[model samples]
Target: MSVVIERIPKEAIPKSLLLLADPSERQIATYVQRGLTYVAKQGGSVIGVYVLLETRPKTMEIMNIAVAEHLQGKGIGKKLLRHAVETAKGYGMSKLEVGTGNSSVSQLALYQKCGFRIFSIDFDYFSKHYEEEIIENGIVCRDMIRLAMELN
Candidate 1:
């Protein structure tokens, strides 16, 4: 399949961006300034999307990544991730970072496969910060796993 990555327009935020973050933390407007929303299209259909936050001029943090539920496990997410990394490189970034719930094994493994390494763990970070418990597939989020990879 041919994969094409494009920058999403602000008007398309509601449709192109996934609501992985809570409403209070969903800084949509700030994202428009410090992040990038990229859609991966294959065969003229949208297959996946990724959000990359510019943490520093030479580093990026992945906020969220998703492939259509129907299209999971088909390498679409991997392609999108590589594209994001390449895009970071184009912007002169030297590092890429991402964080996920401690219980999200799939997400952790995906980042590992994409060359990320565990850099830190924030124990009880979610419980301390969020008013509501962070949950993943019915599991409460008590901690956070931070991972990073060198893009240089």
Candidate 2:
């Protein structure tokens, strides 16, 4: 499927779709406001969404990048990330970062394949931050791997 990625308002981001990326609505709300949102659409339907937040000068962070269930492994996500990187570079961002859980094996591989390198790891990030345990791919979500890609 062909997807067109474009800039969108945070309010336009669907909460259900956001849930696919973030477990906590409160957590998504807390950080989503600071960043601009982008959506990947196919024939007027939004299949993926991501948020880009500038945590510090020259640094842009990506949050809640989720694609449709059926299109998860079809390169839709990589296209989204590529668009994000290009957009960040245009805005003069020197670094672009993304965070994912340890249990997200596929996502980890995808980000790294897209040229992101591990910047740091937040130990027990999910357990400590969320009220309940998050399990994915038969493993408990613990660490949050922060990955970075330099645009400079």
Candidate 3:
């Protein structure tokens, strides 16, 4: 089934469930309180979500984003990414940014296709921040690839 995008209601927000996309409750907490949550929904069912926050003056960052496992390659992730950039532009932001675990290949390519360029790398970010070992595809998810794109 095809899905459309919309801003989720705030009061009845199910922000915590965002962990379903990217597990890491504690990391989600770091930006949930200060960001806006947008989702890709179909027939009232959410398939993907993205948390956007203004990490610094004039810069908006997509702190966490994920699509439901069952719907991983259905383009929902790409839609939400563009949605984030558009939303940030509406907020008068000149640039939009996001970071991901080194092993997150899908996310890296999607962001690049959406015009986000790598601007920095955070070595040992996952190890230093989380007490548990975060491994994906047999590789230790340690580095963080920060990417940015102009909204204008």
RMSD of each: 2.6, 1.1, 1.7
In candidate 1, what are the lDDT values of residues 1-152, reduced to their tens digit?
A: 77788888756763433654423344455565567888877776877777888886688987777677777888887888898889889989999998888878888898899999999999997787667776777887788899999988
Would you estimate the TM-scores of all the predictions? Answer: 0.82, 0.95, 0.90
Error of 2 at 83 (Å): 0.7
Give stretches of model 3 more than 4 Å off. 9-11, 15-17
> Please, what are the lDDT tens digits per residue for candidate 3 over residues 33-138?
7788887888567777888888788999888787878778888888888788889999999989999989888778888988999989999988888788878888
lDDT of each: 0.78, 0.89, 0.81
TM-score of 2: 0.95
C-alpha lDDT of residue 16 in model 3: 49
| Candidate with more favorable, higher lDDT: 1 or 3 | 3
lDDT of 2 by residue, 74-126 (tens): 88989989999998999999999999998999999999999999889999889
Rank by lDDT (best first): 2, 3, 1
Tell me how candidate 2 scores on lDDT. Answer: 0.89
Q: How many backbone clashes does candidate 2 have?
A: 0
Instruction: Specify the highest-lDDT model's number.
Output: 2
- Flag regions of model 1 displaced more than 4 Å: 14-17, 20-25, 128-130
